[PDB]
Amino acid sequence: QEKLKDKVIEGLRNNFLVALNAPTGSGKTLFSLLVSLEVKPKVLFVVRTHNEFYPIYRDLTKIREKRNITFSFLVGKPSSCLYAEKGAESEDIPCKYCELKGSIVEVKTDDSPLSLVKKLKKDGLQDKFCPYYSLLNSLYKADVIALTYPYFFIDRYREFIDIDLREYMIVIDEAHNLDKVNELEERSLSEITIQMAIKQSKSEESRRILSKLLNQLREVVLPDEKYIKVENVPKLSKEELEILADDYEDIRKDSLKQGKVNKIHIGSILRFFSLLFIPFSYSKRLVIKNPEISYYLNLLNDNELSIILMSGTLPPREYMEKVWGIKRNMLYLDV
Numbered sequence: 375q376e377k378l379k380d381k382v383i384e385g386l387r388n389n390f391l392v393a394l395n396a397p398t399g400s401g402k403t404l405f406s407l408l409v410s411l412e413v414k415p416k417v418l419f420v421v422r423t424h425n426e427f428y429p430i431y432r433d434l435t436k437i438r439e440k441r442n443i444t445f446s447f448l449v450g451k452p453s454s455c456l457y458a459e460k461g462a463e464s465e466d467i468p469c470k471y472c473e474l475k476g477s478i479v480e481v482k483t484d485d486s487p488l489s490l491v492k493k494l495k496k497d498g499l500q501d502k503f504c505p506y507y508s509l510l511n512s513l514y515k516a517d518v519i520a521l522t523y524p525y526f527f528i529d530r531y532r533e534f535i536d537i538d539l540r541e542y543m544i545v546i547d548e549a550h551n552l553d554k555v556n557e558l559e560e561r562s563l564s565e566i567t568i569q570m571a572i573k574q575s576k577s578e579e580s581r582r583i584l585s586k587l588l589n590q591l592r593e594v595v596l597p598d599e600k601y602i603k604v605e606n607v608p609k610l611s612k613e614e615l616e617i618l619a620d621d622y623e624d625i626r627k628d629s630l631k632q633g634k635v636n637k638i639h640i641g642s643i644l645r646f647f648s649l650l651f652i653p654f655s656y657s658k659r660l661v662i663k664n665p666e667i668s669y670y671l672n673l674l675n676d677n678e679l680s681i682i683l684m685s686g687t688l689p690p691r692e693y694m695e696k697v698w699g700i701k702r703n704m705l706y707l708d709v
């Protein structure tokens with residue numbers, strides 16, 4: 375339009391969450407960066423997946439000719455570690471034992487995101503530095519950053535980074551996608567996972583405990599493709615959990631000795647038992663259903679955070695209040 379912008383700046387300066395219904399594909403990155411100047415020193419774009427880094431990179435290279443700004447993004451350890459294979463979870467990455475953990479290089483973000491990451495992996499192996507910690511370090515300095523939904527909304531991933539969100543104007547584009555944040559975790563335990571953990575194991579005691587757990591699971595689960603409540607779920611004592619936990623560490627040590635980090639199945643199991651809640655049977659698997667969508671989005675109610683939501687098909691005010699649980703004052707602008 376013009377300068378619905380002083381509206382946005384005033385909105386943010388009054389601690390209103392700004393919800394912007396905007397016709398799509400219209401220089402949105404430039405708009406957000408301009409309105410940040412007046413509000414916050416840095417900008418954070420929260421995006422669905424790492425595939426949304428590229429369009430942001432494309433848009434602000436145009437901006438970089440008129441204004442000097444640094445862009446950085448975070449990809450997980452599984453996408454940046456020198457030794458990671460497909461299937462490797464972030465906690466499986468054995469940085470505790472790796473010589474490169476404290477080996478950082480200065481990153482130059484004139485490359486696109488996939489180009490940058492591939493270059494850091496190639497150079498990292500030759501010149502002995504860690505791509506991940508190099509990206510992480512570059513992230514903490516940058517004027518504009520971008521993170522994926524898991525790193526912003528999900529505790530498991532949020533604990534991997536050390537970032538004060540109060541320094542950022544937080545922009546969540548395609549914000550209708552926030553509706554799916556409650557589908558990003560799966561908190562389940564299957565027969566096959568346990569058996570794969572038995573195969574992968576490096577101690578008899580761990581195999582014995584995993585085997586007893588496999589049996590316990592079989593008594594409670596039911597074959598029905600239907601959620602059914604379970605009384606008396608399997609139990610692991612503190613001392614049994616100790617033995618399963620040092621088995622995890624032994625597999626992590628061994629993997630780093632090889633060039634090669636794979637999925638460690640016992641990690642999944644131990645994380646399932648951190649949550650114990652009402653547990654269910656679904657299709658021979660034990661499941662803890664995910665929280666409601668408002669549990670994940672509750673963070674948006676903290677008045678300490680300056681937040682803009684934008685979308686072409688933003689949900690009605692009523693739905694954002696009742697279903698997403700946004701109870702903080704909201705400046706809803708239909709452009």
Ligand code: SF4
Binds near residue numbers: 475
């Ligand atoms: S290279 Fe080493 S330090 Fe870097 S992520 Fe992989 S394990 Fe960790």
